[PDB]
Amino acid sequence: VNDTALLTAFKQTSIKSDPTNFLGNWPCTWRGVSCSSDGRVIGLDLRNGGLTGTLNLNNLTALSNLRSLYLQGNNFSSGDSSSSSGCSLEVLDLSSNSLTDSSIVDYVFSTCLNLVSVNFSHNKLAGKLKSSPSASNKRITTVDLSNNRFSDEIPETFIADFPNSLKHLDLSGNNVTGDFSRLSFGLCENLTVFSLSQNSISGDRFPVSLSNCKLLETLNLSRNSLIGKIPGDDYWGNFQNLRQLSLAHNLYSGEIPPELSLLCRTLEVLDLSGNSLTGQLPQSFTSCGSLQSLNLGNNKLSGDFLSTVVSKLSRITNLYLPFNNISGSVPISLTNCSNLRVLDLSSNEFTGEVPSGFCSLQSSSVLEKLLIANNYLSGTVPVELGKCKSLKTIDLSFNALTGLIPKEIWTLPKLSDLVMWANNLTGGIPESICVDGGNLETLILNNNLLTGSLPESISKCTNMLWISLSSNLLTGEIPVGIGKLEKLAILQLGNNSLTGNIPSELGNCKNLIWLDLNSNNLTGNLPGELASQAGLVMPGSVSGKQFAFVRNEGGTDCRGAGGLVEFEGIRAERLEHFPMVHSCPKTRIYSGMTMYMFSSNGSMIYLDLSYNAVSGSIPLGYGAMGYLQVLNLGHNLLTGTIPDSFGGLKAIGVLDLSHNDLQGFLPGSLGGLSFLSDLDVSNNNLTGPIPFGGQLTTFPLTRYANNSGLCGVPLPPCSS
Ligand SMILES: *[C@@H]1O[C@H](CO)[C@@H](O[C@@H]2O[C@H](CO)[C@@H](O[C@@H]3O[C@H](CO[C@H]4O[C@H](CO[C@H]5O[C@H](CO)[C@@H](O)[C@H](O)[C@@H]5O[C@H]5O[C@H](CO)[C@@H](O)[C@H](O)[C@@H]5O)[C@@H](O)[C@H](O[C@H]5O[C@H](CO)[C@@H](O)[C@H](O)[C@@H]5O[C@H]5O[C@H](CO)[C@@H](O)[C@H](O)[C@@H]5O)[C@@H]4O)[C@@H](O)[C@H](O[C@H]4O[C@H](CO)[C@@H](O)[C@H](O)[C@@H]4O[C@H]4O[C@H](CO)[C@@H](O)[C@H](O)[C@@H]4O[C@H]4O[C@H](CO)[C@@H](O)[C@H](O)[C@@H]4O)[C@@H]3O)[C@H](O)[C@H]2NC(C)=O)[C@H](O)[C@H]1NC(C)=O
Ligand SMILES: *[C@@H]1O[C@H](CO)[C@@H](O[C@@H]2O[C@H](CO)[C@@H](O[C@@H]3O[C@H](CO)[C@@H](O)[C@H](O)[C@@H]3O)[C@H](O)[C@H]2NC(C)=O)[C@H](O)[C@H]1NC(C)=O
Ligand SMILES: *[C@@H]1O[C@H](CO[C@H]2O[C@H](CO)[C@@H](O)[C@H](O)[C@@H]2O)[C@@H](O[C@@H]2O[C@H](CO)[C@@H](O)[C@H](O)[C@H]2NC(C)=O)[C@H](O)[C@H]1NC(C)=O
Ligand SMILES: CC(C)[C@H](C)[C@@H](O)[C@H](O)[C@@H](C)[C@H]1CC[C@H]2[C@@H]3CC(=O)[C@H]4C[C@H](O)[C@H](O)C[C@]4(C)[C@H]3CC[C@]12C
Ligand SMILES: *[C@@H]1O[C@H](CO)[C@@H](O[C@@H]2O[C@H](CO)[C@@H](O)[C@H](O)[C@H]2NC(C)=O)[C@H](O)[C@H]1NC(C)=O
Ligand SMILES: *[C@@H]1O[C@H](CO)[C@@H](O[C@@H]2O[C@H](CO)[C@@H](O)[C@H](O)[C@H]2NC(C)=O)[C@H](O)[C@H]1NC(C)=O
Ligand SMILES: *[C@@H]1O[C@H](CO)[C@@H](O[C@@H]2O[C@H](CO)[C@@H](O)[C@H](O)[C@H]2NC(C)=O)[C@H](O)[C@H]1NC(C)=O
Ligand SMILES: *[C@@H]1O[C@H](CO)[C@@H](O[C@@H]2O[C@H](CO)[C@@H](O)[C@H](O)[C@H]2NC(C)=O)[C@H](O)[C@H]1NC(C)=O
Ligand SMILES: *[C@@H]1O[C@H](CO)[C@@H](O[C@@H]2O[C@H](CO)[C@@H](O)[C@H](O)[C@H]2NC(C)=O)[C@H](O)[C@H]1NC(C)=O
Ligand SMILES: *[C@@H]1O[C@H](CO)[C@@H](O)[C@H](O)[C@H]1NC(C)=O
Ligand SMILES: *[C@@H]1O[C@H](CO)[C@@H](O)[C@H](O)[C@H]1NC(C)=O
């Protein structure tokens, strides 16, 4: 069994697909294989090779001298059981694969006594935790079981049963359970990084052994169900080296113990967000000269501690306090934080004016992100913000601002996200956008009082992902240059007074997936190029953004098919009381993060053109939109017939064609539409039988009413 042969064996009895030809030259000359001088294999590096196969580690460990095995970033599944061979690995990397049989972990823990670092992260390893590395293993230092599918309670001695040289143990990203106080860390020597984050571990007390981890640098216990008070008193003196602590998204309550400031000699990161903490950051925390990231969001904190305490922290660079009860005016002492790059105070009870002193710092300010959404700020957008040349994101939405958008905002060089919807801002969009100022990714100013037209200059914002200007007082034509924005994914211009034709150039927007021009004054014909991207849409950087969708539940009497709104830093409760939510008698609020449902070769997703004066026939190409979930062409002057191609709108759930002048029959293929949950073809001149398949026979009468001779259930039968 020569080493040269085993790899070829592995290549034939494992690899199922090599679309990149990563092994075409297949001992030492081969790709990924590193050799020693004596002519023995000691390393196999096949990371990110797009390999599809079935890994059985015993066929690689047969190699006598193999100590390095990199298979991370592939599509390897788990193979048969062990053929009983000897292991010599020191480094093993099986990350980002499709392993499922966790026996591969029991084998590496039983054998592989020279194992230094192992990583199974981002696989599908299932089952309960059981085996810890062999006691004969005297070198293992880092072990990463994170982001798998492990289950059930953790063994009481699991962590403690690790060799004494362990330094880094990552168990985050599974669904293990258990009262945390019953878990033993043992003497917990040499341990510096430990994470149980993102599991279902309960516990109202910490285990006593944890206090033995005197060398701990990162303690991450976030996204569990730990309850009670944060351990105070002298407890945090055990961790004289702790640099990062996270107790976020647990069930902790009470005040933040002043004794937690024992970590302030070395603490660099604290995340206590997502609990039910009250009071303020105790004054004792002034000694945190090393703290860089303070995240206390989604709690119930209040008081003046931003000024009494946080302003005294010099190394602060990332400050998060959104979703709290902090009232009053924003403190100006926060400018004494000279190294502050990101600041988030959204969803508090702030009053007064926008903070601006950050920019007139004796030096240039490094502030890049300023977020104060869902507060009660008033006045105008300070022109002083134009001095913060490092600014990239500005979120002032859902305040009570008024006045114009200063020229100095639109010329901030690095600006990227300009977000101030749900205010009373006036003025227009400069003709000098993205030319003298930053090339934006998001321009979200819906529900304001802006006026004028949309500058043709918008064509210069080639990085644009999301435009929202709905419910303003805009006029003019939609500039044809919009078609140059090939990264533009979302475009909302509803509830304005726009005139002209729908530009054919919209079809050049390669990534456009959401188009809302409803309730304007547009004329002309439906451009056929709006579907010219069906089956070609690539996903893009617009994904991963907080949104909320308010579904108007009032048929066609309610204008538009709902409301999609950017929702960073905003409370749902504040939306459910927005009068535009009362615009429809009945509503439901969906919320989440923007996420494509196709990896490539997609189509448009949302199209609302209702309440205009567009005329002509429905372009047949519109039936090709396979991922289209909404099509609202209602309330126009459309003529002709409903294309039978509409039978290929497999993803559609809402289809509004009412209050037009459509003739002919309903395509029978609509019956094949398995997600069609809301159809309205009433108030046309449609005729003939209603398609007998799908949900079309169960809809209310009002969805077919006022036509010229429709028949069939739910209408009277056509034969009488
Ligand atoms: C422990 O451990 C843990 C784990 O376990 C961790 O955690 C982590 O962390 C991290 C950090 O980073 C993160 O990541 C990140 O994130 C972000 C986002 O975030 C957000 O969100 C998320 C999500 O959420 C979700 O999920 C969850 C769970 O799963 C839940 O809970 C929720 O609810 C949700 O869910 C939802 O959704 C989903 C999806 O869709 C679905 O499915 C469901 O159903 C629903 O619907 C989260 O997670 C987060 O959280 C956070 O935060 C918060 C607030 O803050 C808090 O509370 C928490 O705790 C956390 O925290 C954190 O953070 C913070 C701040 O914030 C701090 O402070 C602390 O410390 C911590 O850390 C939130 O909410 C994003 O953004 C990202 O992404 C990024 O990155 C990546 C890589 O990694 C890439 O790829 C991408 O793209 C991006 O990037 C960016 O950035 C960069 C830089 O770096 C660059 O490069 C790029 O470009 C970008 O940029 C930007 O910008 C620019 C300009 O500048 C432009 O251009 C562009 O375009 C853009 O825009 C990431 O991913 C994660 O997430 C976490 N996880 C967890 C689990 O949590 C921690 O860390 C630890 N700790 C310690 C150690 O201490
Ligand atoms: C700290 O701030 C939070 C967040 O703003 C406050 O919680 C909110 O308090 C209002 C008070 O009316 C709650 O509204 C009530 O809720 C239910 C309907 O959900 C109903 O029983 C009442 O008619 C009323 O509308 C609101 O739901 C609540 N928000 C959340 C997310 O729980 C809190 O009151 C503030 N605390 C102090 C001491 O100021
Ligand atoms: C832009 O369009 C609005 C509204 O017109 C559309 O709706 C109204 C019904 O609301 C309907 O009458 C019209 O045919 C379109 O479907 C215009 O404002 C409306 O003007 C009509 C004129 O009869 C008045 O009866 C309405 O009260 C008035 N307002 C509303 C809310 O309807 C507006 O004039 C148009 N602007 C331009 C520049 O064309
Ligand atoms: C920008 C993209 C990525 C998106 C923001 C994406 O992330 C969202 O998931 C987006 C596609 C989701 C969020 C809200 C959804 C609608 C909510 C709703 O009330 C439903 C009622 C009924 O069930 C109908 O049949 C289908 C309806 C209309 C849904 C269509 C799909 C929507 C729009
Ligand atoms: C690991 O090597 C063993 C030993 O060659 C492989 O087991 C054989 O697989 C072939 C092909 O499927 C069968 O015909 C034999 O009956 C198997 N047993 C033997 C030879 O004793 C095994 O398939 C290899 N595993 C992987 C994942 O490559
Ligand atoms: C990764 O490999 C898995 C199998 O391990 C592939 O999943 C199969 O893909 C075929 C099409 O090639 C489907 O017919 C099967 O139903 C799939 N099986 C399972 C269990 O999902 C998967 O396509 C591969 N992914 C790649 C190469 O990106
Ligand atoms: C479109 O935007 C306008 C902006 O004025 C909204 O008009 C509001 O309508 C309500 C109806 O109850 C009035 O109470 C408000 O006073 C109006 N706003 C203002 C600023 O006067 C309208 O609701 C939006 N939606 C549509 C037309 O469907
Ligand atoms: C998915 O998109 C790809 C993009 O590559 C399409 O395939 C290529 O399209 C480009 C133009 O973008 C042509 O120059 C290539 O000749 C195409 N290659 C092919 C077809 O192999 C692909 O057609 C799209 N798929 C669907 C279902 O629309
Ligand atoms: C079908 O058309 C009739 C006639 O226009 C509609 O009845 C009108 O309803 C509006 C508001 O609902 C009233 O202001 C009118 O006075 C009504 N006219 C008559 C003659 O009664 C009816 O609502 C339409 N049906 C649907 C489902 O839209
Ligand atoms: C582990 O800790 C023990 C006792 O403190 C020490 O002797 C040993 O050298 C440490 N091992 C490593 C690899 O640091
Ligand atoms: C505009 O001002 C009025 C003043 O009464 C206020 O009620 C309204 O909420 C403001 N608009 C917003 C916050 O979008």
Distances (CA, A) of 195 to 38, 222, 569, 600: 41, 8, 27, 35
- Which residues share a beta bridge with 490? 466, 514
CA distance 477 to 464: 19
Atom of ligand 8 nearest to the CA of 534: 28
Q: Which ligand is nearest to the CA of 1?
A: 5
Whole-number Å distance, alpha carbon 188 to ligand 10 midpoint, is: 11
By DSSP bridging, strand 442-444 and strand 466-468 are parallel
**Which residues neighbour 670 within 8 Å (Cβ) at sequence distance 6 or greater?**
646, 647, 655, 676, 679, 691, 693, 694, 696
Q: Cβ(626) to ligand 8 under 6 A?
A: no
3-state percent breakdown (helix, strand, coil) of the chain, nearest 5: 15, 25, 60
Q: How many CA atoms lie within 13 A of 283 on its CB side?
A: 2
What string of DSSP letters covers 562-626? -EEEE-TT--HHHHHTSTTTTTSSSEEEEEEE---S-SSSB---EEE--SS--EEE--GGGGG-T
511-522 exposure pattern, b = at least 16 Cβ within 10 A, e = fewer: bbbbbbbbbbeb
Nearest by Cα to 444 from 345, 539, 545, 520: 545
What string of DSSP letters covers 172-202? -SSEEEEEGGG---TT--S--EEE--SSEEE
Residues recorded for the chain: 720
Whole-number Å distance, alpha carbon 420 to ligand 11 midpoint, is: 13
- CB count, 10 Å around CB of 49? 23
The vertex-694 CA angle with 688 and 699, nearest 5°, equals 70
Element (H, E) at 492: strand 490-492
CB 218 within 8 A of CB 194: yes
- Which residues share a beta bridge with 426? 404
Burial class from Cβ neighbours inside 10 Å (0-12, 13-18, 19+) for residue 20 reads: exposed
Phi, psi at 8, each rounded to 5°: -60, -40
Q: How many CA atoms lie within 13 A of 141 on its CB side?
A: 6
Distances (CA, A) of 351 to 374, 378, 403, 509: 11, 7, 17, 41
Q: Which ligand is nearest to the CA of 595?
A: 4
Q: What amino acid is encoded at 236 in this protein?
A: W
Q: What amino acid is encoded at 367 in this protein?
A: L
Radius of gyration of the CA atoms of the chain, in A: 31
CB 530 within 8 A of CB 606: no
CA distance 649 to 628: 7
Q: Which two tokens stand for residue 114?
A: 């020279």
Distinct helix (H) and strand (E) counts, the chain: 6, 51
Q: Which two tokens stand for residue 452?
A: 């004028």
Distances (CA, A) of 112 to 60, 72, 92, 532: 13, 19, 10, 57
Residue owning the nearest CA to atom 101 of ligand 1 = 541
The residues after which the chain has a C–N gap greater than 2.5 Å are 26
CB 322 within 8 A of CB 350: no
Phi, psi at 31, each rounded to 5°: -80, 140
Q: Cβ(475) to ligand 3 under 6 A?
A: no
CA distance 134 to 111: 7
CA distance 522 to 704: 26
Q: Which ligand is nearest to the CA of 62?
A: 5
Whole-number Å distance, alpha carbon 471 to ligand 7 midpoint, is: 8
CA distance 710 to 699: 14
Nearest by Cα to 441 from 479, 468, 423, 421: 468
- Which residues share a beta bridge with 34? 43
Whole-number Å distance, alpha carbon 560 to ligand 1 midpoint, is: 33
Q: Which two tokens stand for residue 418?
A: 């300009």
Whole-number Å distance, alpha carbon 544 to ligand 1 midpoint, is: 9
Q: Cβ(424) to ligand 11 under 6 A?
A: yes
Q: Cβ(511) to ligand 7 under 6 A?
A: no
Nearest by Cα to 399 from 355, 363, 465: 355
CA distance 607 to 601: 18
Burial class from Cβ neighbours inside 10 Å (0-12, 13-18, 19+) for residue 461 reads: buried
Whole-number Å distance, alpha carbon 683 to ligand 9 midpoint, is: 10
164-178 exposure pattern, b = at least 16 Cβ within 10 A, e = fewer: eebbbbbbbbbebeb
Q: Cβ(402) to ligand 11 under 6 A?
A: no
Whole-number Å distance, alpha carbon 534 to ligand 8 midpoint, is: 12
Q: Cβ(573) to ligand 2 under 6 A?
A: yes
- CB count, 10 Å around CB of 15? 19
Distances (CA, A) of 29 to 34, 46, 68: 8, 14, 17
Q: Cβ(495) to ligand 7 under 6 A?
A: yes
Mutational test site, ligand 9, from 656, 657, 660, 683, max ligand atoms within 8 Å of CB = 683
CA distance 651 to 246: 41
**Pocket lining for ligand 10, CB < 6 angstroms:** 164-165, 189-190
Mutational test site, ligand 7, from 449, 580, 582, 611, max ligand atoms within 8 Å of CB = 580
Q: Which ligand is nearest to the CA of 187?
A: 10
Nearest by Cα to 120 from 149, 91, 96, 137: 96
CA distance 211 to 397: 45
- CB count, 10 Å around CB of 586? 9
Determine the distance from the C-alpha atom of residue 114 to the mean position of all C-alpha atoms in its chain, rounded to a whole number: 40
Element (H, E) at 686: strand 685-686
Whole-number Å distance, alpha carbon 378 to ligand 11 midpoint, is: 10
Tokens 């023995």 — which residue? 40
Q: How many CA atoms lie within 13 A of 21 on its CB side?
A: 2
Residue owning the nearest CA to atom 1 of ligand 10 = 165
CA distance 294 to 670: 54
Burial class from Cβ neighbours inside 10 Å (0-12, 13-18, 19+) for residue 471 reads: buried
**Pocket lining for ligand 6, CB < 6 angstroms:** 17, 52, 75, 77, 98
What string of DSSP letters covers 260-311? GGGGGGT--EEE--SSEEES---GGGGG-TT--EEE--SS---SSHHHHTGG
Residue owning the nearest CA to atom 17 of ligand 8 = 536
- CB count, 10 Å around CB of 195? 21
CA distance 245 to 290: 13
Whole-number Å distance, alpha carbon 635 to ligand 3 midpoint, is: 12
CA distance 363 to 338: 9
By DSSP bridging, strand 606-608 and strand 630-632 are parallel
Atom of ligand 6 nearest to the CA of 54: 5
First to last CA, the chain: 85
Q: Which two tokens stand for residue 264?
A: 């302030």
Full set of structural domains in the chain with CATH: 1-124 (3.80.10.10), 480-711 (3.80.10.10)
- Indicate the DSSP class of residue 163: -
The vertex-654 CA angle with 633 and 546, nearest 5°, equals 100
Helices (H), ranges, 223-265? none
- Indicate the DSSP class of residue 164: T
Nearest by Cα to 116 from 135, 92, 136: 92
CB 487 within 8 A of CB 462: yes
Element (H, E) at 8: helix 3-12
Element (H, E) at 514: strand 514-516
Q: Which two tokens stand for residue 651?
A: 């993803």
Distances (CA, A) of 386 to 331, 340, 415, 706: 20, 17, 10, 57
What resolution in angstrom units was achieved for this structure?
Answer: 2.6
CB 156 within 8 A of CB 133: no
Helices (H), ranges, 391-521? 407-410
CA distance 550 to 27: 62
- Which residues share a beta bridge with 269? 244, 293
Helices (H), ranges, 311-452? 407-410
Q: Cβ(668) to ligand 8 under 6 A?
A: no
Nearest by Cα to 281 from 435, 290, 537, 297: 297
CB 512 within 8 A of CB 489: yes
Q: Which two tokens stand for residue 460?
A: 């210069």
Mutational test site, ligand 8, from 510, 601, 627, max ligand atoms within 8 Å of CB = 601
Q: What amino acid is encoded at 140 in this protein?
A: I
- Which residues share a beta bridge with 226? none
Whole-number Å distance, alpha carbon 216 to ligand 10 midpoint, is: 14
Q: Cβ(520) to ligand 7 under 6 A?
A: no
CA distance 533 to 540: 15
* Bond before 714 cis per omega within 30 degrees: yes
CA distance 517 to 468: 11
Whole-number Å distance, alpha carbon 573 to ligand 2 midpoint, is: 8
- Indicate the DSSP class of residue 413: T
CA distance 631 to 88: 61
- Which residues share a beta bridge with 649? none
Q: Which ligand is nearest to the CA of 611?
A: 3
